[PDB]
């Protein structure tokens, strides 16, 4: 037997009600936790006690093509959020749909954290957008 | 119903805490106060309802719950009974079937009762009658009682240790420690022989004065000496003068029952409210010669360090420490539970008969042995398993795995000290 | 065919030759397609359906019906005193190839899960599914020739070989089988009666089963050294 | 004479009762101790005294394919352990079976320490799971 | 064997009927006695006599995040106690629940002693609240 | 028969490992405890059943299994025997044929 087949074409990302499209040629998505699950402590005599970290935030980096139209939407969304009172909410779930199940995480209460760097040359350079999340939840299809 | 927003039931009775450990006690007694062959209780109050203060089945329970922390539960078994009638009635059977009988004004009266019983179509088939008169079991009946002043009644245990133990095991298998009311030489030896073929421990007491003399085990023939000669590693014998009609075995059981298996030492135990072993003739603590005589028989006793009673050594009749036996039994139980949990819960899959499936079993065996190493019971271990490429095909059709083995090493403890010194001006 | 039983005469006697209750008669006839379960509540209750539902929802030939855990079903109890069966009665059921609900010590689990003929339920169900899959795949090939032919020459025979091999590989992927072989006749040596009847014969194949583990035997030692 | 032959196919890893499969194309397993065995101290005059460290913990890094089914099992196991009381145990022996004897260590009382980083591109990227252990024991077949 | 594992997530503090939440990133709790247990006295000849101090008061310092909602509750509680007669009671037990048993003390008849210092910058600064107690009792689970 | 889902036979006797190599030992002794001219054993326990502790055929086997690792198997041969009678009976033959005699 062989495992399920991966297909970049059938990967869809969404946030704030819009769909993000125009993935870059390579490495168009990254997910990572901020801190590890456990932190061991070893005494001078060799005894071990475990600390279970409570932090569960993370980061979602999505990278797009230079002339993708999704760049305009994110800039337009960012411009709106700068003119909103602190009481108004700016976070939304970052949902990734992948029929192959190669992505195991979803972003709970994600926010926009950084803007892309812009570079120009003879060829096209990608643009990286960075997001945060209150809790990067890892789930699976229960065997 | 209507309940107050806050409910407070304050009382003035002080209470203590219980604890849970490996094994539960069972007390096998001659009784007719209930129909079931085994019945459980959780406190002395419940025991007092079924039994009176003067029965041994109540003394045994009273001794058990004197220690602290308490044992969670206690079981009581019922032995078979035979009843006898004479001239210086009511007959009951399993299921509440009761029939009275009467003749009015000895062999003639006994035969009248026998004829009335054998003529009754409701209870006769569940009992048997014979001429004094004797009444015993019959057919499926497992319970029979006789009660009633021109007629006299008696009772006596009517089964051997083997039969009673088998009949009680065929009802409830949840018990580890077993103690008995009967203290005759034959029953004790039979029960010791039976428990040896099982993973249980049999606690017994003794007060035979012939055990306190003679250091040669070859010539001695009292009960402790016979137990020692047979190397019954699963029998614990305690010497105590008050073993005539009192049961300190239960206090000794409760001393270590509440705690975890393989992580304690049963020697130098302190029992609350239990006096030392006293010579019956003059009520004085045993001399060192009598202690040595008990020692050669692998029989325990209650010693005085000078102001405090303490049970000494705590070894079985076979010479093996109680701690080792109980720890080994717990280890086996833990392995059995862990592998059972692995094999079950495959609800939709398989454990294939290849090296991938065998390594998964290796993993659980290693984890279950590490659980024992963490207790400081063991110190090291090893495991060996067969290769899936060299298993006989008969096993693959039978769906069974064989040839698994492991080894371990024990830790030990300290119980006595030897000391020497000197004093000088220089 | 799933059935239950509560005949107390089945719990005694280890000689199958002398026994004549229903499970013994089923075992004697080698009815490999009959599953018998012993349960006291089989008088007017139907645990057979719970046992069926335990494994029905899953794929064929990829599970084991032994050591099954059923929700809400109690163990097999002796009718006379409502206590779990002794080992002797379990052996008496065992010699009859009759199933039962055992207690590992705190949990009820149906044990073995074999038919009256001694064959595991898994093998029977997997073989039936394999036959059905072959039947569907070849049917899909033969149909859908809507405007063409499958000519009676080696070119047409190799096309059937291909689908048979694919359908057996589907079973190999489940870990039901482990290897297989296929043989087909040459079109140059087929009798002309078959060519007029438009039928293909002499196709055969073989397979090998995988297996599973259900019990464990263990030994060990403890020492100071 | 020549030494024994190595075979990646016949390497099996197990932990928590499950078998871990689907090794990545390269470097699918790593084992390492946290601290060295000895730490020399040299005085101004040249004398030497040795310190014998008591620490014996370690780390086990196992790396799997992007779409391996063992990724779901570990996520499902991790999700359970987050909803368990501190008194419940979460450690288990990490057993590695290797007929060639090229791996000399086993993990005693290992725990899950970190979750994999997730990245996506035109091709498949591996996922790294990291474990700890109370005592990374080095053993050998006694000559 | 290894000791019990510490977990900041499962630590709960309570006082005056309210629950205090929103612990700071680091060092969110401190407990200390005011005076030592014994005070030796040595004569000119070397003799020693011991003084056993009767003082058993202490201090409990709990530190919270800048925007934690528990800051408002404590300010609101403090405002009430300023408008109460001296005869009214202001002390209450400070109870700390910790399943790992790493905290061995509880505050008997604790009171609010100091208010936090407030500082603002580019980032978030914590706020420290200080309490007293008549008797900082050290207890343990009896072996 | 009914077998437990998990069977565990723990014991307290320490045990050692054997090994296999080239060649097996044979001990030629004067004996009459069995009819076959060669009989094999795999442990000292089996040897103790046929022979008593004071026979050389038992001492030889006891010496062999003192070393570690153990030898897999040991053979014992039987020499021909002649018997003598005097005045300070039962006669047996191959196949269990026995006949008593008396005067």
Three state DSSP letters for C134-202: HHHHHHHHHCCCCCCCCCCCHHHHHHHHHHHHHHHHHHHHCCCEEEEEEECCCHHHCCHHHHHHCCCCC
Does residue C173 belong to the interface with chain A, where contact is any CB pair within 8 Å?
A: yes
Chain E residues in contact with A51 (beta carbon < 8 A): 5-7
CA A38 to chain D, closest CA, distance in angstroms equals 5
- Whether E100 sits inside 8 A of D109 (CB atoms) is no
What residue of F is the nearest CA neighbor of B329?
A: F10
**Closest-CA residue of chain C to A2:** C173
Is B374 within 8 Å of chain E by CB?
Answer: yes
Closest chain A residue by Cα to residue C176: A1
The residue written with tokens 């992927």 in the block is: C173
Instruction: Name the minimum distance, in Å, from the CA of E5 to any CA of chain D.
Output: 7
Of A47, A48, A52, the CB nearest to E7: A52
Is the separation of the CB atoms in B257 and B315 below 8 Å?
no
Distance between C154 CA and the closest CA of chain F, angstroms: 54
DSSP per residue, D63-119 = EE-TT-THHHHHHHHHHHHTTS-TTS---EEEEEE-TT----EEEEEEEEEE---EE
Q: Give CA–CA dist C27/C97, Å, rounded.
A: 6
Chain B CA closest to residue F3: B400
Nearest CB among D69, D115, D132 relative to A3 is that of: D69
For residue D4, what is the DSSP state?
Answer: P
Residue B397, C-beta contacts closer than 8 angstroms, at least 6 positions apart: C211
Q: How far apart are CA C52 and CA C48, in angstroms?
A: 6
Rounded CA gap, F93 and B123, in Å? 67
| CB distance C36 to C26 below 8 Å | yes
**Among C34, C8, C31, C40, which Cα is nearest to C21's?**
C8
Which chains are adjacent to chain C, needing at least 3 Cβ pairs under 8 Å? Answer: A, B, F
Size of interface D-E (CB pairs under 8 A): 12
Cβ of B28: how many Cβ atoms within 10 Å? 24
Contact F10 B331 (CB under 8 A): yes
CA D110 to chain centre: 8
Mutate to test the interface with C, among B197, B401, B411 (most CBs of C within 10 A): B401
Of C107, C218, C225, nearest to B404 by CB-CB distance is C218
Q: Which residues of chain B make contact with C83, given a CB cutoff of 8 A?
A: 170-172
Neighbouring subunits of A (3+ Cβ pairs under 8 A): C, D, E
Q: Long-range contacts: C54-58, Cβ < 8 Å, 24+? A: C54/B347, C54/C110, C55/C121, C58/B348
Per-residue CA distances from F42 to E116, F46, F47, F49, F82 (Å): 84, 7, 8, 12, 30
Instruction: Name chain F contacts of C76, Cβ cutoff 8 Å.
Output: none
Q: Inter-chain contact F14–C111, Cβ cutoff 8 Å? A: no
Are B340 and F8 inside 8 Å of each other by CB? no
Q: Distance between CA atoms of B241 and E117, rounded to whole angstroms?
A: 76
User: Are β-strands A29-33 and B127-130 bridged in parallel, bridged antiparallel, or unpaired?
Assistant: unpaired
- Separation in Å, CA of F49 to nearest CA in chain C: 24
Instruction: Find tokens 């991790």 and name the residue.
Output: D78
Say how many CA atoms lie within 13 Å of B347 toward its Cβ.
14
Contacts of E1 in chain B (CB under 8 A): 374-376
Helices and strands counted in chain E (H then E) = 1, 9
Q: CB C66 to CB B399 under 8 A?
A: yes
C80 HSE (CA, 13 A, CB side): 13
Q: Do D54 and A32 touch (CB under 8 A)?
A: no
**Six-digit token string for B163:** 């039969």
Q: Is the separation of the CB atoms in A49 and E2 below 8 Å?
A: yes
- The span from the CA of D25 to the CA of D66, in Å, is 11
Name the residue of chain B whose CA is nearest to D10's CA: B355
From the list C96, C107, C103, C87, the residue with the least C-alpha distance to C35 is: C96
D134 contacts in chain A (CB < 8 Å)? 48
Task: Give F80's strand partners.
Answer: none
Give the CA angle between residues C140, C144, C146 to the nearest 5°.
Answer: 165
How far from the centroid of its chain's Cα atoms is residue B355's Cα? Answer: 43
DSSP per position, D32-71: EESS-SEEEEE-TTS-EEEEE-----EEEEEEE-TT-THH
């Amino acid at each position: 037997a062989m495992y399920q087949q991966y297909s970049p074409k059938d990967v869809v990302c969404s946030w704030n009600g819009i769909a993000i499209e125009g993935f870059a040629p390579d490495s168009f998505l990254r997910l990572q936790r901020t801190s590890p699950l456990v932190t061991p402590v070893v005494g001078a005599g060799g005894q071990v006690a475990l600390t279970r970290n409570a932090d569960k935030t993370g980061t979602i980096e999505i990278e797009l093509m230079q002339t993708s139209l999704s760049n305009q939407m994110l800039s337009a969304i960012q411009a709106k959020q700068d003119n909103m009172e602190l009481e108004e909410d700016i976070s939304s779930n970052f949902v990734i749909y992948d029929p192959s199940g190669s992505v195991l995480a979803t972003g709970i209460n994600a926010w926009l954290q950084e803007l892309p760097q812009i570079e120009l040359g003879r060829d096209q350079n990608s643009k990286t957008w960075i997001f945060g999340c209150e809790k990067l939840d890892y789930t699976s299809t229960i065997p | 119903m209507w309940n107050p927003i806050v409910n407070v039931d304050i009382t003035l009775n002080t209470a203590g805490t219980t604890r849970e450990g490996f094994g539960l006690p069972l007390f096998l007694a001659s009784t007719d106060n209930f129909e079931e062959r085994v019945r459980g209780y959780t406190s002395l109050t419940e025991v007092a309802e079924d039994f009176d203060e003067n029965t041994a089945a109540y003394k045994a329970a009273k001794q058990l719950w004197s220690q602290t922390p308490k044992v969670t539960q206690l079981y009581i078994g019922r032995r078979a009974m035979q009843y006898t009638v004479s001239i210086p009635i009511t007959v009951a059977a399993g299921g509440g079937i009761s029939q009275p009988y009467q003749y009015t004004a000895a062999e003639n009266v006994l035969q009248q009762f026998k004829t009335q019983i054998e003529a009754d179509p409701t209870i006769k088939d569940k009992v048997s009658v014979n001429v004094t008169m004797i009444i015993t079991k019959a057919g499926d009946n497992d319970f029979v009682k006789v009660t009633t002043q021109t007629v006299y009644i008696a009772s006596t245990t009517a089964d051997t240790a083997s039969t009673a133990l088998a009949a009680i095991e065929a009802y409830s298998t949840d018990w580890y420690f077993i103690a008995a009311e009967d203290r005759t030489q034959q029953f004790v030896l039979a029960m010791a022989s039976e428990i040896q073929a099982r993973k249980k421990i049999f606690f017994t007491a003794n007060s035979d004065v012939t055990a306190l003399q003679g250091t040669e085990l070859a010539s001695a023939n009292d009960v402790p000496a016979q137990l020692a000669k047979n190397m019954y590693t699963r029998t614990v014998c305690l010497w105590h003068h008050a073993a005539a009609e009192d049961y300190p075995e239960m206090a000794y059981i409760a001393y270590g029952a509440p705690y975890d298996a393989g992580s304690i030492a049963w020697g130098n135990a302190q029992l609350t409210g239990v006096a030392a072993s006293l010579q019956p003739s003059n009520q004085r603590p045993l001399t060192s010669i009598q202690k040595s005589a008990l020692d050669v028989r692998h029989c325990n006793f209650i010693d005085l360090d000078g102001g405090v009673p303490v049970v000494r050594r705590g070894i079985t009749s076979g010479g093996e420490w109680i701690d080792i036996v109980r720890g080994v039994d717990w280890l086996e139980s833990d392995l059995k539970t862990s592998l059972r949990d692995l094999l079950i819960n495959q609800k939709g899959g398989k454990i294939t008969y290849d090296d991938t499936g065998i390594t998964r079993i290796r993993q659980v065996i290693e984890t279950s042995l590490q659980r024992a190493v963490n207790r400081n019971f063991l110190s090291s271990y090893t495991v060996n398993v067969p290769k899936a490429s060299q298993v006989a095909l008969a096993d693959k059709k039978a769906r069974i795995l064989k040839d698994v083995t492991f080894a371990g090493i024990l830790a030990g403890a300290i119980l006595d000290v030897d000391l020497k010194g000197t004093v000088a001006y220089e």
